[PDB]
Amino acid sequence: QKVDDDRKHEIEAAIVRIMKSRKKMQHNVLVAEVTQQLKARFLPSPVVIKKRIEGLIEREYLARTPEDRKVYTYVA
Amino acid sequence: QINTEYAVSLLEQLKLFYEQQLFTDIVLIVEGTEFPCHKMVLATCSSYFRAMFMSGLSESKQTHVHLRNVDAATLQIIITYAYTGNLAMNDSTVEQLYETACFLQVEDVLQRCREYLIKKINAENCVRLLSFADLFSCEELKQSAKRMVEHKFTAVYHQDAFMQLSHDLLIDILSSDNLNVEKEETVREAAMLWLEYNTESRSQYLSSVLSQIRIDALSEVTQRAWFQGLPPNDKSVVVQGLYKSMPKFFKPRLGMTKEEMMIFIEASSENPCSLYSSVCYSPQAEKVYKLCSPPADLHKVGTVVTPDNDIYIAGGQVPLKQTAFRTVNCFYWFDAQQNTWFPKTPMLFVRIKPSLVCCEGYIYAIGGDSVGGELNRRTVERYDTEKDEWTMVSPLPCAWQWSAAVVVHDCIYVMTLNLMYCYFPRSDSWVEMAMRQTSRSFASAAAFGDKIFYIGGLGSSVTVEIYDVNKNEWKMAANIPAKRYSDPCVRAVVISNSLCVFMRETHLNERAKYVTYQYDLELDRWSLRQHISERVLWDLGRDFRCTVGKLYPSCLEESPWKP
């Protein structure tokens, strides 16, 4: 459980550190990049990352609206 | 000469008469729409109305003619062109415009729409335009469609209109020696899928379509598949094709003659007749094939090779009609077979040494010493290969001079002396990238895989700074082992799935020497791949550019020049 939470923060920190200076995704564009960056770390765990990326929509700092995908909120 | 003032006065008075309906005597009845007009204007414009009125038939004295098999809008635009000379041609109604022009036999509008269609030919309407040119006899359109259809379709072979084509047209297309295919099997399966579009409507053409393809695939697979689709108990086709493939000895096509070659532009004119010329080096044939001169000796231009292996030229300057040069925003496309530069839609602003980069089917020209030079002196603009038009993109935040750009991971990476910015086509924005630790300019970069290799910079040097796109970090690898007291001219390029370098070096009181090296990606070392003998390649100059592309040695000719 502890290492699962470790992976949970490891993916979120990477996605908030990298995607602030990159482009946006439509359906499954940036997930490939985030899995490649963590390819040497552990398994991609597609279901876990898919379930966790959609939890940040509840507030600011790149809410990643399931509506607008063309351009993301590159604001802070 | 004829007084133009009286001519235009007469034309505008006649158009006023047409709008006001004073001297109209004949009315065109088309699908219940009244078209009051005159006989003189119709006779002067169309060659059918001159045979409709001055013929002595029943319509000579009749004042009401029911013109059928025509369109109201097309007739209206033809009449208004005949009355004022303005032909507003859009991108949709040109088909019916040509139909009605051919029906009415009007030469001027026919020529105008023929020119518009010769300009509008592209990939997504190639087969439709070829079918249209087959329906109505038009040799110029037919030939242009032949060439463009051959190339683009043999690249794509997926158009829906290809199924609905006449037998003679397909026989001409398949049997031609201008098809561009990396293999002879894709045309085979294209013919098979076209034949299987019907069952009995194509049986008679089955004996003819196989007569144009080489017998190398007329005895292998895709013969039992036709037997599966054969009509039942038909014994006139199986035994026919069983003993039929005796003639038509296998002859290699022309599309399988593309080789990875280094295209050079603005080379030193062997004979000083012209200021510069264009040549090409053959990494496999070890020869130097000549290339067609740039359009109107267009100097200071940029090159790009799309993933579809297409060459384009943008920007440049022409000597104005001693130093004399004027910059023009003309755009051109190179024909891989006809060995000529076909003009295309010009840009909006003129450029000098533009960086042409292809991405997502769009041609990106970043910078290039624009004539504007305003607040946004860093405005970049993309080109649409589908609509044949140019569209502005997000401007570069910083104004840079003597820069290079590459495309990696579906993004535009433009490099300057020390800064780098990545453009996101999806969001149309620029993001700050890593900063180089060395101030170098007048260099070129080659995109190999997911890495950017900035080679050389300032003559140039052997400094190499490798940028990991995924790790966002600039790092040094090594320095190219060259000669002392020498000025090498480095050229980064990708060839044979490896990063090679075209470096020409010159010693003191010695002529330039040509040699290329293969850089080991894992070993961080430049290995001698091949040495270019001076017996075939002569001096090219300093402002010459190199690019990676494929060309046909058969269509091109060897350059006659002494070693």
Buried/exposed A15-41: b ≥16 CB within 10 Å, e otherwise: beeebeebbbbeeeebbebbbebbeee
> Number of structural domains, chain B?
2
Q: Give the minimum alpha-carbon distance from A70 to chain B in angstroms, rounded to a whole number.
A: 6
Domain end marker among B110, B135, B160: B135
Interface list for chain B against chain A, based on CB atoms closer than 8 Å: 411, 424-429, 431-432, 470, 472
Q: If we measure between CA atoms, which residue out of B486, B509, B501 comes closest to residue B448?
A: B501
Among A21, A70, A72, whose Cβ lies nearest the Cβ of B431?
A: A21
- Residue A47 at interface with chain B, using a CB cutoff of 8 Å: no
SS3 content of chain B, % helix, strand, coil (to 5): 25, 25, 50
Cα–Cα distances (Å) from B400 to B102, B286, B366, B397, B443, in that order, read 54, 38, 10, 9, 14
Domain end marker among B107, B135, B163: B135
Could you tell me if B127 and B270 lie in one domain? no
Indicate yes or no: CB of A26 within 8 angstroms of CB of B411.
no
Count Cβ atoms within 10 A of the Cβ of residue B314 and give its class: 0-12 exposed, 13-18 middle, 19 or more buried.
buried
Q: Is residue B105 part of a domain?
A: yes
CA distance B372 to B389: 20
Between β-strands B545-551 and B525-531, what pairing exists: parallel, antiparallel or unpaired? unpaired
CA distance B552 to B104: 44
CA distance B451 to B332: 30
Question: CB-based contacts of B232: which residues, under 8 Å, 6+ apart?
Answer: none
**Per-residue 3-state assignment (H helix, E strand, C coil) for B20-52:** HCCCCCEEEEECCEEEEECHHHHHHHCCCCHHH
Structure tokens at B180: 């561009």
Taking contacts as CB-CB distances below 8 angstroms, the residues of chain B near A34 are none
Taking contacts as CB-CB distances below 8 angstroms, the residues of chain B near A22 are 424, 431
Indicate yes or no: CB of B424 within 8 angstroms of CB of A24.
yes
CA distance B427 to B215: 52
Residue B115: what residue type?
A: E
Q: Is residue B20 part of a domain?
A: yes
Q: Give the minimum alpha-carbon distance from A59 to chain B in angstroms, rounded to a whole number.
A: 22
Structure tokens at B386: 């589908």
Indicate yes or no: CB of B426 within 8 angstroms of CB of A21.
no
Q: Is residue B500 part of a domain?
A: yes
Could you tell me if B131 and B263 lie in one domain? no
Domain end marker among B135, B154, B188: B135
Q: Is residue B444 part of a domain?
A: yes
Indicate yes or no: CB of A22 within 8 angstroms of CB of B432.
no
- Residue A70 at interface with chain B, using a CB cutoff of 8 Å: yes
Cα–Cα distances (Å) from B486 to B458, B461, B481, B540, in that order, read 15, 10, 12, 17
Taking contacts as CB-CB distances below 8 angstroms, the residues of chain B near A36 are 470
The number of C-alpha atoms within 13 Å of B220 and in the hemisphere containing its C-beta is 9
Among B425, B428, B431, whose Cβ lies nearest the Cβ of A22?
A: B431
CA distance B355 to B109: 39
Resolution of the PDB structure in angstroms: 7.4
Q: Is residue B152 part of a domain?
A: no
Q: Give the minimum alpha-carbon distance from B384 to chain A in angstroms, rounded to a whole number.
A: 20
CATH number, domain containing residue B110: 3.30.710.10
- Residue A24 at interface with chain B, using a CB cutoff of 8 Å: yes
DSSP B353-378: S-EEEEETTEEEEE-S--S--STTTT
Among A21, A23, A33, whose Cβ lies nearest the Cβ of B427?
A: A23
Q: Give the minimum alpha-carbon distance from B52 to chain A in angstroms, rounded to a whole number.
A: 59
CATH number, domain containing residue B441: 2.120.10.80
- Residue A34 at interface with chain B, using a CB cutoff of 8 Å: no
Q: Are B15 and B38 in contact (CB under 8 A)?
A: no
Place of tokens 């036999």: B105
Q: Is residue B299 part of a domain?
A: yes
Could you tell me if B263 and B399 lie in one domain? yes
Q: If we measure between CA atoms, which residue out of A75, A34, A76 comes closest to residue A52?
A: A34
Q: Is residue B151 part of a domain?
A: no
Tell me how far apart the 2 most distant CA atoms of chain A are, in Å.
36
Taking contacts as CB-CB distances below 8 angstroms, the residues of chain A near B359 are none
Taking contacts as CB-CB distances below 8 angstroms, the residues of chain B near A29 are 426
- Residue A42 at interface with chain B, using a CB cutoff of 8 Å: no
Indicate yes or no: CB of A70 within 8 angstroms of CB of B426.
yes
Q: Are B279 and B547 in contact (CB under 8 A)?
A: no
Q: Give the minimum alpha-carbon distance from B409 to chain A in angstroms, rounded to a whole number.
A: 10
- Residue A23 at interface with chain B, using a CB cutoff of 8 Å: yes
Place of tokens 């894992």: B522
Indicate yes or no: CB of B427 within 8 angstroms of CB of A72.
yes
Q: Give the minimum alpha-carbon distance from A58 to chain B in angstroms, rounded to a whole number.
A: 23
Q: Are B561 and B538 in contact (CB under 8 A)?
A: yes
CB atoms within 10 A of CB B451: 16
Q: If we measure between CA atoms, which residue out of B444, B452, B364 comes closest to residue B404?
A: B444
DSSP state of B288: E
Indicate yes or no: CB of B427 within 8 angstroms of CB of A37.
no
Count Cβ atoms within 10 A of the Cβ of residue A1 and give its class: 0-12 exposed, 13-18 middle, 19 or more buried.
exposed
Between β-strands B512-520 and B473-479, what pairing exists: parallel, antiparallel or unpaired? unpaired
Give φ, ψ of B133 to 5 degrees: -70, -25
For B422, nearest residue in chain A (alpha carbons):
A22
Buried/exposed B211-233: b ≥16 CB within 10 Å, e otherwise: bbbbbbbbeeeeeeebeeebeee
For residues B177, B181, B184 and B188, what is the CA-based torsion angle, rounded to 10 degrees? -90
Give φ, ψ of B254 to 5 degrees: -100, -20
Tell me the three state secondary structure of residue B152: helix
Indicate yes or no: CB of A71 within 8 angstroms of CB of B411.
no
Among B424, B428, B470, whose Cβ lies nearest the Cβ of A37?
A: B470
Taking contacts as CB-CB distances below 8 angstroms, the residues of chain B near A33 are 470
Test the A interface: residue of B427, B432, B435, B468 with most A CBs within 10 Å:
B427
Q: B514 pairs with which residues across the strands?
A: B504
Can you state the angle between helices B107-120 and B139-156, rounded to 10 degrees?
20
Query: Which residues of chain A come before a gap where C and the next N are over 2.5 Å apart?
Result: none
Please name the method used to determine this structure: cryo-EM
Structure tokens at B270: 């062997």
Tell me the three state secondary structure of residue B240: helix
Taking contacts as CB-CB distances below 8 angstroms, the residues of chain A near B432 are 21
Taking contacts as CB-CB distances below 8 angstroms, the residues of chain A near B393 are none
* Residue-range definition of the domain harbouring residue B475: 259-558
Give φ, ψ of B201 to 5 degrees: -75, -10
Structure tokens at B262: 């280094």
For B429, nearest residue in chain A (alpha carbons):
A23
For B411, nearest residue in chain A (alpha carbons):
A23
Buried/exposed B142-156: b ≥16 CB within 10 Å, e otherwise: bebbbbbbbbbbbbe
Q: Give the minimum alpha-carbon distance from B414 to chain A in angstroms, rounded to a whole number.
A: 15
Residue B464: what residue type?
A: V
Q: If we measure between CA atoms, which residue out of B251, B246, B187, B180 comes closest to residue B214?
A: B251
Distance of CA B35 to the CA centre of its chain: 43
Q: Is residue B243 part of a domain?
A: no
Q: Return the CA Rg of chain B.
A: 30
Among B427, B428, B432, whose Cβ lies nearest the Cβ of A21?
A: B432
CA distance A66 to B424: 20
Q: Are B556 and B289 in contact (CB under 8 A)?
A: yes
Indicate yes or no: CB of B427 within 8 angstroms of CB of A22.
no
- Residue A27 at interface with chain B, using a CB cutoff of 8 Å: no
